[PDB]
Amino acid sequence: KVFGRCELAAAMKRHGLDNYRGYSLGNWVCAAKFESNFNTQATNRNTDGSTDYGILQINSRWWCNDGRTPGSRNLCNIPCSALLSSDITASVNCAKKIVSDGNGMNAWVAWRNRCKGTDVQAWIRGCR
Numbered sequence: 001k002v003f004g005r006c007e008l009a010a011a012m013k014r015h016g017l018d019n020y021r022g023y024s025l026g027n028w029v030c031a032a033k034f035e036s037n038f039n040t041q042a043t044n045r046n047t048d049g050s051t052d053y054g055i056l057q058i059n060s061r062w063w064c065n066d067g068r069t070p071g072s073r074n075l076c077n078i079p080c081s082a083l084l085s086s087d088i089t090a091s092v093n094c095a096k097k098i099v100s101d102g103n104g105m106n107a108w109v110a111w112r113n114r115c116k117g118t119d120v121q122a123w124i125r126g127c128r
């Protein structure tokens with residue numbers, strides 16, 4: 001599923017991400033834009049042998065099990081493929097754990113490089 005921008009904003013809001021750990025909704029929408037282009041099916045492999053999964057590009061070294069990542073920790077206790085669903089519930093539940101683990105949204109590299117410190121509220125412009 002490729003979410004619309006306001007469509008994703010509404011879903012993230014309904015799941016309680018707006019201001020979760022102090023990160024406004026625009027931060028989360030911006031992160032998803034640059035991590036996955038709003039595509040729930042997005043996957044990308046990394047040099048360490050891990051892969052990123054889904055709308056928020058959750059990493060298989062730390063958070064989910066994909067059966068092929070050395071040193072995996074599976075801290076969200078979930079198969080990585082469940083993070084590719086059209087329903088964002090599992091990704092949101094796991095993201096809440098990730099952002100609570102110490103480093104806040106710095107866990108998301110694209111957020112750090114492209115959203116952090118920018119006018120993120122623009123990502124929710126026009127949304128109801």
Ligand SMILES: CC(=O)N[C@H]1[C@H](O[C@H]2[C@H](O)[C@@H](O)CN[C@@H]2CO)O[C@H](CO)[C@@H](O[C@@H]2O[C@H](CO)[C@@H](O[C@@H]3O[C@H](CO)[C@@H](O)[C@H](O)[C@H]3NC(C)=O)[C@H](O)[C@H]2NC(C)=O)[C@@H]1O
Nearest residue numbers: 046052057058059061062063098101102103107108109110
């Ligand atoms: C969303 C996500 O899964 N982010 C992880 C990120 O994934 C990137 C990928 O690296 C890129 O190539 C492409 N995109 C994705 C998404 O942007 O990958 C990072 C590197 O593996 C992960 O960062 C590590 O996260 C762990 C766990 O949170 C960090 O360990 C924690 O560190 C804090 C502070 O030092 C400490 O208090 C915690 O106790 C500790 N947790 C654990 C379980 O040990 C670790 O520092 C990060 N490493 C780096 C280099 O940032 C990121 O989660």
